């Protein structure tokens, strides 16, 4: 019953092929609802879920202005980071930012977050108290000094505790039917021989929402975690998710192996068996 709203921002320099590419996406839980792409023709923040479409033109015009303003700041940042790390002009670099808030099953604030990465690793992040910063290296300490002098954490806290959770509430209620649903996984296992002495056992979960799920194999009751292949949870394309886990087993021993599925839409965690 727990929820989150998160915004994700990626900017990539392409020196000598123009301005940095900029992409922004917003999600409530695992459902995307807005996007902006610097290279598209529209130059607008655009809807990506039916329930956001009812927002009026002040919403669209405002979010378009704000996201284009985020784009400019990242364009500056790319310059500044090259300087902080004494890096050359002729390599592509990546800045990423994500922020947002979580609320409980009662829709009260749990947690807020605001973090930044450069070239794929942590750069700087607001700590859990929303009053201080974790800086990952010496360059990020320079950002820390500048952000403490500019009282950035206090403006951010006000957003994450107030605004963020107000709008998350609004979205959860406007988007009730799709965001406040739980679709339980439809489960099964497959069996295929890989030779005359071994078989692949694969545990499947289909058509579930939200995306969080655990799938595990046991052999006579003990976890086979180091022998399991577990894929990344993947979108079906229709708003639900899929996941599988597999083990390769000696033929004859199938009935020792069970698959265990935990998901919030199950009344009880399921145990699937070969007998």
């Amino acid at each position: 019953g727990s929820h989150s709203m998160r915004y994700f921002f990626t900017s990539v320099s392409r020196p000598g092929r123009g301005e940095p590419r900029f992409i922004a996406v917003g999600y409530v839980d695992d459902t995307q609802f807005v996007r902006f792409d610097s290279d598209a023709a529209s130059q607008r923040m655009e809807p990506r879920a039916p329930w956001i479409e009812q927002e009026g033109p002040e919403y669209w015009d405002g979010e378009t202005r704000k996201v284009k303003a985020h784009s400019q700041t990242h364009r500056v940042d790319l310059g500044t980071l090259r300087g902080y790390y004494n890096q050359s002009e002729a390599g592509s670099h990546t800045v990423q930012r994500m922020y947002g808030c979580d609320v409980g099953s009662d829709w009260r604030f749990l947690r807020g977050y605001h973090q930044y990465a450069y070239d794929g690793k942590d750069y700087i992040a607001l700590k859990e108290d929303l009053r201080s910063w974790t800086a990952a290296d010496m360059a990020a300490q320079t950002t820390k000094h500048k952000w403490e002098a500019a009282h950035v954490a206090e403006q951010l806290r006000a957003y994450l505790e107030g605004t963020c959770v107000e709008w998350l509430r609004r979205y959860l209620e406007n988007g009730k039917e799709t965001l406040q649903r739980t679709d339980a996984p439809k489960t099964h296992m497959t069996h295929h021989a890989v030779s005359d002495h071994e078989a692949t056992l694969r545990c499947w979960a289909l058509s579930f929402y939200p995306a969080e799920i655990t799938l595990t194999w046991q052999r006579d009751g003990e976890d086979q975690t180091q022998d399991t292949e577990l894929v990344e949870t993947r979108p079906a394309g229709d708003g639900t998710f899929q996941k599988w886990a597999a083990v390769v087993v000696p033929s004859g021993q199938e009935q020792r192996y069970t698959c265990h599925v935990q998901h919030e839409g199950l009344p009880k965690p399921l145990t699937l068996r070969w007998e």
Binding site: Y7, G26, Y59, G62, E63, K66, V67, A69, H70, T73, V76, D77, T80, L81, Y84, R97, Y99, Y116, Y123, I124, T143, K146, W147, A150, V152, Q155, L156, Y159, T163, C164, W167
Partner: peptide, 9 residues
């Protein structure tokens, strides 16, 4: 809704 303009690094 997003936050306002982020402060430069």
């Amino acid at each position: 809704i997003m936050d306002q303009v982020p402060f430069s690094v």
